[PDB]
Symmetry: C4
Subunit: 106 residues, 4 copies
């Protein structure tokens, strides 16, 4: 170990954001839960340990999805997490798209 990474995954719609990473501190999660709506919360779950936020009453179009990704990337960069890679898929039957963002420590 000693090489911590972070994965943020975002599925739409409705928006469901998950954050995974062994060195991810709750204080980082709390900073992002204030940025993303700009009083919805991230809930913690184990195996694998992660934080999950669902915006049940929200619908994001392409522009607002771009804004969500940007706020996450900017918030995490300020916390010492650098963006290294991303990927995305769209599921034709559910009509949902999922995007993953991978970060490394500097």
């Amino acid at each position: 170990s000693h090489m911590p990474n972070l994965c943020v995954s975002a599925t739409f719609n409705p928006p469901v954001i998950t954050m995974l990473g062994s060195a991810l501190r709750e204080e980082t999660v709390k900073l992002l839960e204030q940025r993303i709506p700009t009083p919805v919360k991230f809930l913690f779950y184990p195996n694998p340990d992660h934080w999950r936020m669902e915006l049940s009453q929200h619908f994001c179009d392409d522009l607002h999805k771009s804004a969500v990704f940007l706020t996450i990337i900017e918030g995490l960069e300020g916390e010492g997490w650098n963006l290294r890679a991303s990927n995305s898929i769209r599921d034709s039957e559910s009509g949902k798209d999922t995007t993953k963002l991978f970060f490394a420590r500097r």
Copy 2:
């Protein structure tokens, strides 16, 4: 500061989000890639090429011009992703940039 550029085809619709994006950078891209129009909430620049059709090769050329234009302005490419929507027949690609500072 970071920047997200999103490009949907077809017709081409290019959106650029990032508070630190200069209007001078936007103008350089306009000449490289009709104009980008500014809109608030969220603050962004949007260019729509209604009378244009870009095939796979021209989509690659559009991405390259955007990346090269932004690199010269101090924005480094960090990641990308893409999806194709089977019902609309449209594909959307995102390009993420970070400042070299």
Copy 3:
């Protein structure tokens, strides 16, 4: 082999099938990942193209566990001197399977 070797790790779901390509991938790295991935079974070697393959036949990874699998692979490989450079993913509507690729370069 002018300037530094590379790796490609591909993962298809479901069931999870992980493939690792790259001539410079040492068997010691493959063993470390074998211990890591279930925590988040062995890799078998096949030629033409040379690669390591692991199947988890009795497993069904939801989206969260897919993210955990990618993270364990990235972290394991980073500790071994392999830096993540890019990723991509597709979903096949007819098979219902998604495939994600992770590309690494030497430090």
Copy 4:
């Protein structure tokens, strides 16, 4: 002013296109030799936009061979001074074709 390169690969049959004004023909020839070796043909030049295109009409690549093609391209380019920065991919359900893009920078 900074040169970048985009390599796009569509399957099946495999069609590889390379765009980037600063791409040397020596680099094109190197990849021309590497790509068939990864799966075991030439790249043709076309204008508007200027690019190199290779076909393998008599070939059908499974997911493993697609990974091998991407890896050979990345490794070949890295030796030529091109660093991998990003990738993306889509699958078209009606044509049954998948397209992957690989972006490289000289820096």
